Amino acid sequence: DIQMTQSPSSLSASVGDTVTITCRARHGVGENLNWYQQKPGKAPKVLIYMASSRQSGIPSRFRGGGSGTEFTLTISSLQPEDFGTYHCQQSYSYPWTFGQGTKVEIK
Amino acid sequence: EKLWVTVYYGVPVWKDAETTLFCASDAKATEKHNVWATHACVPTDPNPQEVVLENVTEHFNMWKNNMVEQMQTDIISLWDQSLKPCVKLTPLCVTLNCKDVNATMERGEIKNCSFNITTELRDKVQKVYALFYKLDVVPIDNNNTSYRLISCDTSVITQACPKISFEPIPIHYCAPAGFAILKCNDKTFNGKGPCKNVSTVQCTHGIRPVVSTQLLLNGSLAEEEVVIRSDNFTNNAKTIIVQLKESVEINCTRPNNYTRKSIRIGPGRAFYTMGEIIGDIRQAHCNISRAKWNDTLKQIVIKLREQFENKTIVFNHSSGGDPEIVMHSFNCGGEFFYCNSTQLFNSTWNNTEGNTITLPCRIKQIINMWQRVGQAMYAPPIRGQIRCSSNITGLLLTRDENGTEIFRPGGGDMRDNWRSELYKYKVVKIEPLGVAPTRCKRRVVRRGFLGAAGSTMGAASMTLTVQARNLLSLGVWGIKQLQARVLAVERYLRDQQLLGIWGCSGKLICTTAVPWNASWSNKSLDRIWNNMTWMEWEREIDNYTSEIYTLIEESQNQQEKNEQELLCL
Numbered sequence: 001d002i003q004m005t006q007s008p009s010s011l012s013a014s015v016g017d018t019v020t021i022t023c024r025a026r027h028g029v030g031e032n033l034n035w036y037q038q039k040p041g042k043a044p045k046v047l048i049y050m051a052s053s054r055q056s057g058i059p060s061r062f063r064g065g066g067s068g069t070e071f072t073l074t075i076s077s078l079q080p081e082d083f084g085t086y087h088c089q090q091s092y093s094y095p096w097t098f099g100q101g102t103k104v105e106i107k
Numbered sequence: 108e109k110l111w112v113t114v115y116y117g118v119p120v121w122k123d124a125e126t127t128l129f130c131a132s133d134a135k136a137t138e139k140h141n142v143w144a145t146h147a148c149v150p151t152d153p154n155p156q157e158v159v160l161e162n163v164t165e166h167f168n169m170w171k172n173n174m175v176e177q178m179q180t181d182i183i184s185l186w187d188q189s190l191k192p193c194v195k196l197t198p199l200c201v202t203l204n205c206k207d208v209n210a211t212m213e214r215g216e217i218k219n220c221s222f223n224i225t226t227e228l229r230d231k232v233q234k235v236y237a238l239f240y241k242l243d244v245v246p247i248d249n250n251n252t253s254y255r256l257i258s259c260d261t262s263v264i265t266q267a268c269p270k271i272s273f274e275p276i277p278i279h280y281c282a283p284a285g286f287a288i289l290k291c292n293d294k295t296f297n298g299k300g301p302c303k304n305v306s307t308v309q310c311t312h313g314i315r316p317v318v319s320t321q322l323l324l325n326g327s328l329a330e331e332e333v334v335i336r337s338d339n340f341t342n343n344a345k346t347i348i349v350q351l352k353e354s355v356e357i358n359c360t361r362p363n364n365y366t367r368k369s370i371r372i373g374p375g376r377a378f379y380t381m382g383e384i385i386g387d388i389r390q391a392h393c394n395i396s397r398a399k400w401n402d403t404l405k406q407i408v409i410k411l412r413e414q415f416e417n418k419t420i421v422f423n424h425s426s427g428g429d430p431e432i433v434m435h436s437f438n439c440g441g442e443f444f445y446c447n448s449t450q451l452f453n454s455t456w457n458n459t460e461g462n463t464i465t466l467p468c469r470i471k472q473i474i475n476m477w478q479r480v481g482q483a484m485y486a487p488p489i490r491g492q493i494r495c496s497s498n499i500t501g502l503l504l505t506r507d508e509n510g511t512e513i514f515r516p517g518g519g520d521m522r523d524n525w526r527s528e529l530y531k532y533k534v535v536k537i538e539p540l541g542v543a544p545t546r547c548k549r550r551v552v553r554r555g556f557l558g559a560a561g562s563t564m565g566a567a568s569m570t571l572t573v574q575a576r577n578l579l580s581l582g583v584w585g586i587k588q589l590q591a592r593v594l595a596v597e598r599y600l601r602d603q604q605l606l607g608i609w610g611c612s613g614k615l616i617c618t619t620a621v622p623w624n625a626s627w628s629n630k631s632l633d634r635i636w637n638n639m640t641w642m643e644w645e646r647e648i649d650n651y652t653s654e655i656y657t658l659i660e661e662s663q664n665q666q667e668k669n670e671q672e673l674l675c676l
């Protein structure tokens with residue numbers, strides 16, 4: 001099983017700034033890393049598909065990229081609606097493991 | 108009394124030309140996987156420039172405008188590029204066992220078809236079922252329940268990738284450096300002939316690549332009145348493009364919800380089709396306000412009467428035939444609607460109930476779009492209630508005998524939709540070099556780009572810098588961008604080479620040693636410099652230009668360079 005980590009484990013920022021969450025793999029996965037947004041008490045929804053491909057309905061404020069083992073999610077012009085826990089998942093090889101998640105508090 | 112040839116660089120002279128144009132878009136409009144690939148276009152400038160050309164009258168002809176053919180080529184190439192990396196439905200051409208789905212309710216419009224699919228991935232025949240629209244399935248074996256998918260026998264059906272969006276995004280056309288686009292600003296311009304208010308732009312306004320027939324949607328409206336345009340106009344076999352003064356709001360809908368299922372075709376590939384119907388079954392329809400359409404026809408009839416003399420005008424429905432060409436059509440919401448439109452062309456005007464006209468509409472998935480044979484697209488189900496609320500801004504009419512003219516909704520190819528937006532634009536080629544007589548021998552207020560074009564040669568001659576400071580500086584748009592840059596480079600170097608040989612590489616005004624020959628133009632300098640514009644002069648000198656150039660290089664730079672070579676001693 002490919003082990004996943006994420007950094008920072010706890011993040012906070014004010015409305016309108018730009019933040020970065022980095023998801024790290026023990027082994028390379030090409031571009032096959034998905035990003036999800038989980039609201040407290042709700043199931044997550046996917047934000048980014050193959051590392052950089054954004055899901056329709058998600059505003060352009062959510063950007064991402066990277067390859068190999070180090071990937072980033074960049075959230076520009078942070079909004080109150082962006083409060084929640086972000087997760088990253090590898091689709092390259094089975095099991096499709098997840099990182100521990102990053103909690104984003106909005107101030 | 109002796110006049111000498113002098114070379115000018117930056118002459119506001121243009122000639123008609125056909126060139127490759129490149130695209131631009133509003134980078135802050137901006138979804139990817141859009142069929143129009145607008146993310147590959149150069150971002151537009153917030154400042155559009157727009158220089159009004161005083162004293163310039165230009166001849167515009169919408170029916171021979173290369174920009175329309177170029178746009179059609181780009182639109183078709185973009186569709187083929189977008190659809191290419193998608194699932195082919197070749198394995199899906201199988202015998203369908205179809206029964207009517209029982210239920211303004213529909214009466215047999217949706218069929219429940221069960222068929223068995225042979226799949227490569229495993230030797231496996233699976234009995235699957237799917238829902239299809241009546242227009243998607245062609246009956247076979249007489250009265251048997253056997254059907255096939257429409258156009259399978261004539262084309263290879265390509266499934267559109269569900270991630271592909273069909274939303275129109277305005278596309279700006281921009282001339283390569285060294286070329287310019289002239290825009291006609293006449294309020295009642297009829298599409299042909301002279302235009303008085305002509306402005307120069309680098310890029311056109313945004314054009315929404317809306318694909319429709321009979322009625323023009325979105326786009327742009329006329330400013331003063333309804334304008335009816337044609338080519339010969341006498342010839343009944345010519346499309347009449349009607350641009351409206353005020354838009355008509357048309358609200359089309361597909362009230363059914365449905366669900367979507369995926370039937371695997373092969374590894375990594377599946378057929379996306381309609382599943383169980385959620386909710387009741389209601390006919391798709393479109394609501395257009397009656398009073399607004401009534402006034403729209405009143406204005407159209409007035410203009411048609413003015414151009415066709417005081418004859419009776421009657422609007423009829425289009426002749427029966429293939430729904431793709433005899434019905435109004437559009438791709439609103441990602442689904443493809445075909446609407447009857449008869450209620451809009453069913454009245455005699457010569458010289459009463461219901462606030463809204465409801466047009467029945469039918470949904471089709473297998474589309475032989477662009478009037479081609481051998482290709483077809485399958486649009487996956489959207490699974491949603493499509494509220495459209497689009498603007499009608501123009502009509503395409505055709506003409507067919509007791510003193511009455513009969514008009515039908517219709518048109519030719521999709522080009523008619525784009526002329527409506529490109530009618531005011533012309534692409535021209537700038538040739539910044541020219542020659543003129545002056546009194547000087549070598550003896551070894553600003554308006555913007557081409558703003559002096561309508562001025563006399565004098566007064567215009569002090570703005571040559573304005574043009575000199577201009578000119579220069581893997582999909583469809585990438586290649587066209589590459590061709591545009593290479594063309595601009597080639598033209599800049601041709602001009603620089605000509606200036607280099609003459610002996611004028613560093614000057615906007617360059618004096619030569621070649622005397623002026625009275626046979627070229629037997630006119631005094633005041634008759635030339637204070638009467639003619641640079642374009643009239645260039646046309647007048649167009650028969651002797653190669654002679655002047657031959658004399659200037661031969662006698663001025665291959666002899667100056669030999670006389671100087673001898674004088675050093």
Ligand SMILES: *[C@@H]1O[C@H](CO)[C@@H](O[C@@H]2O[C@H](CO)[C@@H](O[C@@H]3O[C@H](CO)[C@@H](O)[C@H](O[C@H]4O[C@H](CO)[C@@H](O)[C@H](O)[C@@H]4O[C@H]4O[C@H](CO)[C@@H](O)[C@H](O)[C@@H]4O)[C@@H]3O)[C@H](O)[C@H]2NC(C)=O)[C@H](O)[C@H]1NC(C)=O
Nearest residue numbers: 056057272317324325437438439440441489495496497498
């Ligand atoms: C002429 O102009 C009129 C007036 O503008 C045009 O009308 C607009 O039409 C568009 C196209 O439908 C419409 O935009 C939709 O608005 C919906 C409002 O509820 C949105 O829900 C919808 O978003 C979905 O589709 C988008 C395009 O695919 C996606 O970017 C977006 O993320 C959403 O995607 C969801 O749904 C799709 C379904 O296909 C699915 O694939 C995805 O997974 C996801 O579930 C659109 O933004 C505008 O609202 C209309 N404007 C008005 C004022 O009504 C009209 O279309 C033009 N005429 C023609 C002929 O094109």
Ligand SMILES: *[C@@H]1O[C@H](CO)[C@@H](O[C@@H]2O[C@H](CO)[C@@H](O)[C@H](O)[C@H]2NC(C)=O)[C@H](O)[C@H]1NC(C)=O
Nearest residue numbers: 208209219220221234235236237238382383384
């Ligand atoms: C269309 O036909 C399919 C058959 O392929 C229908 O499927 C049956 O539906 C009933 C209940 O409606 C179930 O009890 C059966 O088990 C289904 N059989 C299958 C899937 O083989 C389907 O209901 C019909 N759908 C519509 C929209 O009419």
Ligand SMILES: *[C@@H]1O[C@H](CO)[C@@H](O)[C@H](O)[C@H]1NC(C)=O
Nearest residue numbers: 202203204221222223232234
């Ligand atoms: C294929 O389907 C038809 C009805 O559509 C059925 O009569 C036939 O038996 C099926 N054959 C196989 C091999 O599944």
Ligand SMILES: *[C@@H]1O[C@H](CO)[C@@H](O)[C@H](O)[C@H]1NC(C)=O
Nearest residue numbers: 157159292293294304305306
């Ligand atoms: C002429 O064209 C310019 C283009 O900028 C426009 O602003 C102006 O109103 C037009 N005038 C007339 C009389 O058409």
Ligand SMILES: *[C@@H]1O[C@H](CO)[C@@H](O)[C@H](O)[C@H]1NC(C)=O
Nearest residue numbers: 325326327354356497498499
């Ligand atoms: C449609 O017409 C309305 C009329 O009020 C206008 O506000 C709207 O911007 C128009 N939409 C388009 C896409 O042209």
Ligand SMILES: *[C@@H]1O[C@H](CO)[C@@H](O)[C@H](O)[C@H]1NC(C)=O
Nearest residue numbers: 338339340341342343344345
């Ligand atoms: C216009 O159409 C008429 C049809 O009567 C034809 O005689 C005429 O030659 C046409 N003229 C042009 C310029 O197309």
Ligand SMILES: *[C@@H]1O[C@H](CO)[C@@H](O)[C@H](O)[C@H]1NC(C)=O
Nearest residue numbers: 362363364386387388389492
């Ligand atoms: C489709 O779903 C909507 C959800 O609001 C519902 O109102 C509508 O009636 C449904 N359509 C039909 C035809 O039942």
Ligand SMILES: *[C@@H]1O[C@H](CO)[C@@H](O)[C@H](O)[C@H]1NC(C)=O
Nearest residue numbers: 358359360392393394463465
């Ligand atoms: C269209 O008009 C009819 C009139 O009965 C109405 O019932 C229907 O809801 C309208 N449809 C839309 C999409 O507004």
Ligand SMILES: *[C@@H]1O[C@H](CO)[C@@H](O)[C@H](O)[C@H]1NC(C)=O
Nearest residue numbers: 356357358394395396463496
């Ligand atoms: C279309 O729907 C809009 C919804 O805001 C409504 O205002 C408008 O009157 C409708 N037009 C027609 C022609 O029914």
Ligand SMILES: *[C@@H]1O[C@H](CO)[C@@H](O)[C@H](O)[C@H]1NC(C)=O
Nearest residue numbers: 397398401454455456459460
């Ligand atoms: C529309 O014009 C026709 C012309 O014959 C007239 O009979 C009809 O009553 C008018 N309808 C409205 C709603 O103005």
Ligand SMILES: *[C@@H]1O[C@H](CO)[C@@H](O)[C@H](O)[C@H]1NC(C)=O
Nearest residue numbers: 421422423424426454455513
């Ligand atoms: C055309 O319009 C006339 C108007 O009198 C009508 O009688 C006729 O049925 C319409 N349709 C055709 C196909 O002629």
Ligand SMILES: *[C@@H]1O[C@H](CO)[C@@H](O)[C@H](O)[C@H]1NC(C)=O
Nearest residue numbers: 427428430433434447448449
């Ligand atoms: C439009 O509806 C009328 C209703 O009488 C029908 O006769 C006509 O054939 C329909 N047109 C098309 C193109 O289906």
Ligand SMILES: *[C@@H]1O[C@H](CO)[C@@H](O)[C@H](O)[C@H]1NC(C)=O
Nearest residue numbers: 448449450451452453454455
């Ligand atoms: C066309 O107008 C006539 C006028 O008598 C009317 O009877 C007929 O129903 C109209 N056509 C449609 C499709 O409603």
